[PDB]
Amino acid sequence: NPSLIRSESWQVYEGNEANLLDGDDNTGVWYKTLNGDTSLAGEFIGLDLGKEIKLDGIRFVIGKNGGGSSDKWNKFKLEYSLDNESWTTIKEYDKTGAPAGKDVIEESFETPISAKYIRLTNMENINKWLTFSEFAIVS
Ligand SMILES: CC(=O)N[C@H]1[C@H](O[C@H]2[C@@H](O)[C@H](O)[C@@H](CO)O[C@H]2O)O[C@H](CO)[C@@H](O)[C@@H]1O
Ligand SMILES: [Ca+2]
């Protein structure tokens, strides 16, 4: 199955990283960010798919309840890659000021997309730590 990949600098504050692949929306992880409690544009969390599989969709749940429920990116992108070096943006997002809590980013790909790595990436500095809950693909 797909394995988790994320910005190496993050530190787990509460929960576990395996909670992001257990299929339960109500289990997640709270990551401490460095750089003065700031997630820089360009930081990321996603999946290494193993080989070049063709995807029909993704379902990513960001944020979580209680602790760090408001600790989410404002601006981010969904991007994919073949080599973990060059990336292609599928879609950008701006959810500045949206309510704290879980948020299910769910995308279906009209034309299937050929990828080895698929992730969410920050596009604007934010003075916050980060919560997430689940990451899944659809083929
Ligand atoms: C656990 C928590 O409160 N996390 C905060 C985080 O807090 C830092 C620090 O800024 C703060 O003064 C103390 C107070 O206990 O806790 C630390 O752990 O601050 C960041 C940035 O504001 C929040 O995103 C995060 O939720
Ligand atoms: Ca989960």
Estimate nothing, just give the exact number of structural domains: 1
What characteristic shape results from the CA principal axes?
globular
Number of strands: 8
What fraction of the residues are assigned to beta strands by DSSP?
Answer: over 45%
Order of helices and strands: EEEHEEEEE
The total count of helices amounts to: 1
The hetero molecules present are:
a molecule of 2 linked components (MAN-NAG), calcium ion
In CATH, the architecture is: Sandwich
Computed Rg: 14 Å
Largest sheet: 8 strands, antiparallel
**Quaternary state of the chains:** monomer
Distance between the termini: 12 Å
CATH topology title: Jelly Rolls
Tell me the CATH superfamily: Galactose-binding domain-like
Domain F5/8 type C: 1-139
Subcellular location: Secreted
Family: Belongs to the glycosyl hydrolase 84 family.
Organism: Clostridium perfringens (strain 13 / Type A)
Sum up the structure in keywords:
139 residues, mainly beta, Jelly Rolls, 8-stranded antiparallel sheet, 1 helix, globular, binds a molecule of 2 linked components (MAN-NAG), binds calcium ion
